């Protein structure tokens, strides 16, 4: 009879009524449209909150915690510029795509210092504060793992964390400025305008702030992963190359422009709004001469950038080869031969130029990150706080090697996330007196092993192919299908339900059943994309450069996949030694606009980010929980002022004495009330029933209440006396 | 300590642990002791903390709070002294005004009627005041 949530193709869920019950599916009539009718599987239909106008700060305060009520609550808050909501210790952040007034002010930063989660409105600042507090008290390094798709808000929220910790627990002083200027400088070289994000991160990062024993800031360290190489030479219709190329052209002095032979972006093959290339150059120069970069090193960077540009202009022109060989300190005739001889065909000479471009640029990005690390170095430290900022699972119409690497990353990250949420829920139950929590997740180690296992994993199988006399994308794909013919997570593309995937032949791709759903990989270019070693003739050329700087960027097969496996395993080593918090970032629409909530898109992200698996781990024997403080705040308006004058703890014992609620259905914990399935909804309805009947229930519990108030203060005075004597007893 | 006695100390502990997470520091410990007419120094508090603060962070849970409390004629001497914390002018009776003073010192909010109500319910003889034996009887309920 009560309305329920049921699927909707564009909103995710809609309000409706169950009009018929079958063996597998329910029949739903939408509230909006009488006579309209549709089917939904029984596991796709959810109870709704009775009050559709309210919002809670922690989704655990919902009568029913499920994907549909979560979506609705987040929507309600979003419409009111409350972009932050909790799921217990997890923070969900919805990108508003505009600047909300007070939320990020230095005054707001102060108001969060020292506060526990839930004593202030939900905020990224509260997560950063909990990290510091747990570091100080538990003597343990901390990590904050921030995920979401491109344009969701990972980078911005990471920067909010770093600003918060720096203004709150920083030194003075001077390392502080450098920590918040590190990110903005890496972005010039690693970020690019994309169809999904004008300021897209084309690399992953882990940013550590290190502390001493006294938990004062002593330094920082930045790790970087998976820089996108293809973007250096070619880019999609509506996209740009890395910001640096466009900022350098726009804002360089007549002097720099002269030395580097710089023109408008339209003159360079590698480069051909709300994008202030001119102003961003100024800000980049501010940040450069603040982490201690001198004009000499600054121009060394610009030269290499410019040299990559003029290398791109060589078609298979004369002035391009001249300018290129000058800035990279090469012999014009040595560059010509290496770019044109094994004689090479048109396509093969295009490949050699592009390979040098990418290797030079990549090695330049490595230098930049190492240079930022040299600006806040440290002899030794006691602890760190690390923020991880890397792309989550995301839909792509074509999945290649780049996608394969990031999806693999997210399998291991989601495994960490499952392990940590399970541990919190188990820790909660025993601490509060509930005994054993019997919840579990399905492990994804088998999918992890399919990719990364030694000898038999896809990564090692790929390396084997790179080492053959005649390497082949199709030989590689068959080897995978042959080795893993009957693995549960792998399939052949022609089993797909999508016709486009079925036209992909067996040796042209494979399907992997990832955590977040099936992905069809097209394997063309896998072998090429797995090797980032420059050919020996091109490697020798650039090594014997007349520029010291160019030689030091470099001071045959190098596996891209296994390099990343090594990096990821070290990152997980670190993360496993820390206490972890999780921020889940959400992109509300595909248009970069505010106040525009796309339900089905958001719902899909809530699934790819692991929030659905999380909710299952929170449906233990007692799927509802609220602290005495929040029940007090929620329900005191309904009780007589007598009761409202307690004392959230005694208020709650009073309430459950007067309502006489079964000790099985309602568990009074150490800091929380835990409700059996549906019981919080029952409690809520009782609280909202006849006010007078409720008044009479209090009245009947009066004597016990008075005695309890007496005993609380009598035993407390005894306590103080007992403690006073202990001071004397230990003094004599 | 008996089963009954441990439950009464837990509720008393909630006056120390106002924010309700199960955790005490030196700040809480001091505030409550003073509000009941006691002035322990910084070092005295820190010195007593050490007894059951294994991990050097300055925090304390309830069961540790009980052992921090543990030390023949001494028992009754402590209940007599607890009574005199309430009975400020030492005339042998706890008045409404004296209860309110204690109550409000410990951060409790209630009306003056509610104070009178607490007196009336503890008042066995019906003289409108609470003597020592009525105080003890209530503590033991
Ligand atoms: N909390 C926020 N407040 C204001 N703008 C935001 C916020 N989060 C994201 N944005 C906007 O969205 C853009 C994309 O966000 P970004 O943090 O780069 O996403 P991601 O790193 O996940 O790709 C930003 O450049 C900024 O304009
Ligand atoms: F476009 Be984002 F930095 F994932
Ligand atoms: Ca506390
Ligand atoms: Ca301790
Ligand atoms: Ca008196
Ligand atoms: Ca009396
Ligand atoms: Mg980013």
A255 to A283, A295, A307, A615: CA distances (angstroms): 19, 13, 17, 60
Chain B residues with CB-CB distance to A708 below 8 A: 11
DSSP state for residue A577 in the 8-state scheme? T
Q: Which of A529, A468, A518, A459 is nearest to A490 (CA)?
A: A518
- Residue A392 CA to residue A204 CA, distance in Å, equals 11
Name the closest ligand to CA A147. 1
Determine the Cα–Cα distance for residues A685 and A39; give it in Å rounded to an integer. Answer: 30
Report the C-alpha gap between A18 and A126 in whole angstroms: 41
**Cα gap B24→A396, rounded to integer Å:** 52
- What's the half-sphere exposure (Cβ side, CA atoms, 13 Å) at A239? 19
- E strands along A151-246, which residues? 191-192, 200-201, 204-211, 217-225
Give the HSE-up count for residue A143: Cα atoms under 13 Å, Cβ half-sphere: 22
* Residue ranges of the binding site of B: 17, 19, 21, 23, 28, 53, 55, 57, 59, 64, 87, 89, 91, 98, 123, 125, 127, 129, 134
Extents of the domains making up chain B: 2-72, 73-140
Rg (CA), chain B: 17
Residue A342 and residue A311: Cα distance in Å, rounded? 19
Q: Which helix (DSSP H) or strand (DSSP E) does residue A161 occupy?
A: helix A154-169
Q: Where are the alpha helices (DSSP H) in A395-552?
A: 401-432, 445-452, 458-466, 473-483, 499-502, 526-529, 536-543, 548-552
CB A156 within 8 A of CB A194: no
Question: Cα–chain-centroid distance for residue A339?
Answer: 41
Ligand 2: residue of A93, A95, A146, A150 to mutate (most ligand atoms within 8 A of CB) is: A150
Distance from CA of B10 to the nearest CA of A (A): 9
This entry's atomic model was obtained through: X-ray
How much distance in Å is there from the Cα of B25 to the middle of ligand 3? 7
Nearest in space to A201 (alpha carbons), one of A158, A151, A250: A151
User: In this structure, which residue's CA is closest to atom 1 in ligand 2?
Assistant: A200
8 Å CB contact of B33 and A714: no
Residue B108: DSSP 8-state: -
Between CA A422 and CA A440 the distance in angstroms is 7
CA distances from A65 to A215, A375, A622, A646, B103 (A): 38, 47, 11, 29, 40
Binding-site residue ranges of A for ATP? 148-155
Query: Ligand 1: residues whose CB is within 6 Å?
Result: A 95-97, 99, 148, 150-156, 197, 199-201, 585
What DSSP letter does each residue of A330-366 carry, written as one string?
Answer: --HHHHHHHTT-----HHHHHHHHHHHHHHHHHHHHH
**Å from CA of A321 to ligand 3 middle:** 70
**A717–B78 C-beta distance less than 8 A:** no
Cα–Cα distance for residue pair B33/B20, rounded to 1 Å: 18
Strand, helix or coil at A285? helix
Q: By C-alpha distance, which of A53, A69, A57 is closest to A4?
A: A69
- Cβ(A9)–Cβ(A600) under 8 Å? yes
Q: Using the mean position of ligand 2's atoms as its centre, give its distance from the Cα of residue A128 in Å.
A: 21
Q: How many residues does chain A have?
A: 732
Residues of chain A neighbouring B33 (CB-CB closer than 8 A): 720, 723-724
Query: For testing the chain A interface, which of B1, B7, B17, B20 should be mutated: the one with the most A CBs within 10 Å?
Result: B20
Over the range A182-220, which residues count as b (16 or more CB within 10 Å of their CB) and which as e? bbbbbbbbbbbbbeebbebbbbbbbbbbbbeeebebbbb
Q: Which of A671, A581, A692 is nearest to A93 (CA)?
A: A581
Residues in CB range of A533: below 8 A, 6 or more apart? A539, A556, A557, A558
* Cα A408 to Cα A522: distance, rounded to the nearest angstrom: 16
Q: What is the C-alpha R_g of chain A?
A: 30
Structure tokens at A316: 């298979």
Tell me the catalytic residues of A. Answer: 150-151, 155, 197, 200-201, 392, 394
- Strand order across the beta sheet in which A579-586 lies: A84-87, A90-94, A579-586, A142-147, A383-389, A204-211, A217-225
Report d(CA A517, CA A601) in Å as an integer. Answer: 15
Neighbours of A280 (CB within 10 A): 20
Burial pattern A303-337, b for ≥16 Cβ within 10 A else e, equals bbbbbbbbbbbbeeeeebbebbbbbbbbeeeebee
Domains and CATH numbers, chain A: 1-54 (2.30.30.360), 55-239+379-395+579-621 (3.40.850.10), 240-289 (1.10.10.820), 290-378+533-556 (1.20.120.720), 396-532+557-578 (1.20.58.530), 622-688 (3.30.70.1590), 689-732 (6.10.250.2980)
Structure tokens at A639: 């009780």
In B, which residues are within 8 Å of A725 by CB distance? 71, 74, 78
Give yes or no for residue A531 CB within 6 A of ligand 2. no
8 A C-beta contact, residue A313 and residue A268: yes
Q: Are A460 and A453 in contact (CB under 8 A)?
A: yes
> What residues form DSSP beta bridges with A217?
A211
Q: Report CA dihedral (B128, B130, B134, B140) to the nearest 10 degrees.
A: 120
Instruction: Pick the closest to residue A146 from A197, A95, A106, A78 (CA basis).
Output: A95
Looking at ligand 2, which atom is closest to the CA of residue A197?
1
How many Å apart are CA A595 and CA A96, to the nearest integer? 7
CB nearest to B33's CB, from A139, A649, A720: A720
C-alpha separations of A371 from A176, A222, A308, A359 in Å: 17, 10, 20, 18
Kindly list the strands in the beta sheet with A490-491, ordered across the sheet, starting from the edge strand earlier in the chain. A490-491, A509-514, A517-522
As given in the structure block, the two tokens for residue A403 are 């996608």
- Which chain A residues have any C-beta within 8 angstroms of a chain B C-beta? 116, 119, 136-139, 627-629, 642, 645, 647-650, 670-671, 703, 706-727, 729-730
CA atoms of A340 and A353, how far apart (whole Å): 9
């Amino acid at each position: 009879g009560k309305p329920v949530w049921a699927p909707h193709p564009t909103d995710g869920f809609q309000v409706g009524n169950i009009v018929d019950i079958g063996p597998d599916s329910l029949t739903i009539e939408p509230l909006n449209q009488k006579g309209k009718t549709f089917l939904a599987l029984i596991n796709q239909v959810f109870p709704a909150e009775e009050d559709s106008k309210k919002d809670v700060e922690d989704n655990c305060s919902l009568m029913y915690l499920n994907e549909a009520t979560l979506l609705h609550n987040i929507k309600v808050r979003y419409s009111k510029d409350r972009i932050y909501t909790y799921v217990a210790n997890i923070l969900i952040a919805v990108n508003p795509y505009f600047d909300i007034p007070k939320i990020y002010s230095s005054e707001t930063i102060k108001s969060y210092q020292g506060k526990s989660l839930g004593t202030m409105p939900p905020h990224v600042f509260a997560i950063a504060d909990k990290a510091f507090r747990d570091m100080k008290v538990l003597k343990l390094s901390q990590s904050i793992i921030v995920s979401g798709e491109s344009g969701a808000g990972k980078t911005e929220n990471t920067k909010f964390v770093l600003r918060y910790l720096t203004e709150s627990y920083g030194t003075g002083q001077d390392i502080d400025d450098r920590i918040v200027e590190a990110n903005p400088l890496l972005e010039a070289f690693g970020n690019a305008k994309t169809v999904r994000n004008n300021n897209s991160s084309r690399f992953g990062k882990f940013v550590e702030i290190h502390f001493n024993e006294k938990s004062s800031v002593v330094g920082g360290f930045v790790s970087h992963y998976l820089l996108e190489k293809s973007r250096i030479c070619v880019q999609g219709k509506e996209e740009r190359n890395y910001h640096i190329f466009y900022r350098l052209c726009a804002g360089a002095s007549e002097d720099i422009r002269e030395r580097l032979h710089l023109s408008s972006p339209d003159n360079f093959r590698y480069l051909n709004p709300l994008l202030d290339d001119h102003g961003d150059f100024i800000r980049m120069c501010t940040a450069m001469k603040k982490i201690g970069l001198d004009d000499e090193e600054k121009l060394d960077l610009f030269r290499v950038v410019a040299g990559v540009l003029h290398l791109g202009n060589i078609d298979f022109s004369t002035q391009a080869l001249e300018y290129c060989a000058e800035l990279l300190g090469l012999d014009q005739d040595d560059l010509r031969v290496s770019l044109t001889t094994r004689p090479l065909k048109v396509e093969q000479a295009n490949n050699a130029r592009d390979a040098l471009a990418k290797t030079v640029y990549s090695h330049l990005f490595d230098h930049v990150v190492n240079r930022v690390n040299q600006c806040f170095p440290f002899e030794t430290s006691s602890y760190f706080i690390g923020v991880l900022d890397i792309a989550g699972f995301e839909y792509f119409e074509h999945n290649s090697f780049e996608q394969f690497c990031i999806n693999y990353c997210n399998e291991k990250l989601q495994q960490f996330f499952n392990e940590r949420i399970l541990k919190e829920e188990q820790e909660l139950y025993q601490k509060e007196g509930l005994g054993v929590n019997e919840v579990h997740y399905v492990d994804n180690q088998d999918c992890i092993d399919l990719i990364e296992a030694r000898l038999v994993g896809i990564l090692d199988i790929l390396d084997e192919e790179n080492r053959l006399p005649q390497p082949s994308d199709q030989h590689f794909t068959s080897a995978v299908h042959q080795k893993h013919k009957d693995h549960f997570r792998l399939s052949i593309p022609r089993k797909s339900k999508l016709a486009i995937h079925r036209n992909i032949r067996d040796d042209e791709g494979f399907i992997i059943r990832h955590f977040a759903g099936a992905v069809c990989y097209e394997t063309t270019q896998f072998v090429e994309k797995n090797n980032d070693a420059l050919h020996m003739s091109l490697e020798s050329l650039i090594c014997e450069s007349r520029d010291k700087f160019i030689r030091e960027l470099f001071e045959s097969f190098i596996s891209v996949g296994n390099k990343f496996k090594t990096q990821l395993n070290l990152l997980l080593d670190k993360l496993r030694s820390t206490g972890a918090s999780f921020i889940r970032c959400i992109k509300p629409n595909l248009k970069m606009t505010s106040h525009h909530f796309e339900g089905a898109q958001i719902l899909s992200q809530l699934q790819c980010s692991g929030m659905v698996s999380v909710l299952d781990l929170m449906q233990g024997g007692f799927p509802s929980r609220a602290s005495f403080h929040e029940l007090y705040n929620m329900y005191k308006k309904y009780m007589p002022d007598k009761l409202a004058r307690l004392d959230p703890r005694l208020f709650c014992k009073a309430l459950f004495k007067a309502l006489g609620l079964n000790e099985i259905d309602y568990k009074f914990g150490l800091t929380k009330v835990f409700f059996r399935p549906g019981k919080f909804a029952e409690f809520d309805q009782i609280m909202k029933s006849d006010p007078d009947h409720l008044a009479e229930l209090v009245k009947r519990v009066n004597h016990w209440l008075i005695c309890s108030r007496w005993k609380k203060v009598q035993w407390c005075s005894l306590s103080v006396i007992k403690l006073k004597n202990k001071i004397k007893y230990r003094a004599e | 300590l008996t089963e009954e006695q441990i439950a009464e100390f837990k509720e008393a502990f909630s006056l120390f642990d106002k924010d309700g997470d199960g955790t005490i520091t030196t700040k809480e410990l001091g505030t409550v002791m003073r509000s009941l007419g006691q002035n322990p120094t910084e070092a005295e508090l820190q010195d007593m903390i050490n007894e059951v603060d294994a991990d050097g962070n300055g925090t304390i849970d309830f069961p540790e709070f009980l052992t921090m409390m543990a030390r023949d004629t001494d028992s009754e001497e402590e209940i007599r002294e607890a009574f005199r914390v309430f009975d400020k002018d030492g005339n042998g009776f706890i008045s409404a005004a004296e209860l309110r003073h204690v109550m409000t010192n410990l951060g409790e909010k209630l009306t003056d009627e509610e104070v009178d109500e607490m007196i009336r319910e503890a008042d066995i003889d019906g003289d409108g005041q609470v003597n020592y034996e009525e105080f003890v009887t209530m503590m033991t309920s």
